[PDB]
């Protein structure tokens, strides 16, 4: 429907992934970086919704996984330090979101 919106979503997704990976490599991240990631997360989520307004079952899966990853991140917003356990459970989920989005491409 709108390729411009799809590519905005993609580019935002890429940037979420980069600071995610960047943040993974540090025991403590500045609030600036943590906030960039999460503002970007908010905008990929928003652009994804905008597109719902491939197959329906694949979009459904991706959407459900997005919500789960976003809800997971919100819990991490309350923590000055997120542990390996938390950080890796979030990474695993986020990986499934990326995969399913790429499966639609
Ligand atoms: C929030 C985290 C999300 C991430 C990291 C994410 C990531 C991606 C990625 C990487 C793609 C493939 C883009 C490409 O390579 O061209 C994609 C496509 C897509 N995403 Fe998401 N997504 C997210 C959330 C959502 C949500 C919440 C929705 C819907 C409510 C959504 C709907 C879509 C749709 C419909 C496409 C395919 C668009 C098209 O084919 O024209 N996404 N997503
Ligand atoms: C794909 C969609 C993703 C969404 C919607 C998302 C969302 C969030 C949110 C809302 C937070 C809370 C921010 C904070 O604690 O300050 C967060 C934290 C985090 N995310 Fe993500 N994230 C995604 C992908 C990733 C990926 C792929 C990685 C790693 C490769 C990652 C690594 C992290 C890390 C390490 C934190 C914690 C930062 C810290 O404790 O200093 N995220 N994420
Ligand atoms: Cl804490």
Pocket perturbation via mutation, ligand 1, pick of 66, 74, 103, 105 by most ligand atoms within 8 A of CB: 66
Q: How many domains does the chain have?
A: 1
Interacting residues of 3 by C-beta distance below 8 A, sequence separation 6+ = none
- CB-CB contact of 76 with 90 (8 Å): yes
Distance 26 CA to ligand 1 centre (A): 27
Range(s) of the domain holding residue 62? 3-53+56-104
Q: Which atom of ligand 2 lies nearest, measured to the CA of 41? A: 5
3-state SS assignment for residue 6:
helix
Distance 71 CA to ligand 3 centre (A): 17
* CA 38 vs CA 19, 56, 88: distances in Å: 10, 27, 17
Instruction: Write the DSSP string, 11-77.
Output: HHHHHHHHHHHHHHT-SS--HHHHHHHHHHHHHHHHHHHHHT---HHHHHHHHHHHHHHHHHHHHHH
Burial level of 11, CB count in 10 A (0-12/13-18/19+)?
middle
3-state SS assignment for residue 99:
helix
Distance 15 CA to ligand 1 centre (A): 13
Both structure tokens of 42: 């908010």
d(CA 36, CA 13): 12
Pocket perturbation via mutation, ligand 1, pick of 47, 48, 55 by most ligand atoms within 8 A of CB: 48
Torsion of CA 75, 94, 42, 4, to 10 degrees: -170
């Amino acid at each position: 429907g709108s390729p411009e919106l799809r590519e905005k979503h993609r580019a935002l997704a890429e940037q979420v992934y980069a600071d995610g990976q960047e943040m993974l490599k540090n025991t403590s991240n500045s609030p600036e970086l943590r906030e960039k990631h999460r503002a970007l997360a908010e905008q990929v989520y928003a652009t994804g919704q905008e597109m719902l307004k491939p197959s329906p079952e694949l979009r459904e899966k991706h959407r459900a996984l997005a919500e789960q990853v976003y809800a997971t991140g919100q819990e991490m917003l309350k923590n000055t330090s997120n542990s390996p356990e938390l950080r890796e459970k979030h990474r695993a989920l986020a990986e499934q979101v990326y995969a399913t989005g790429q499966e639609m491409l």
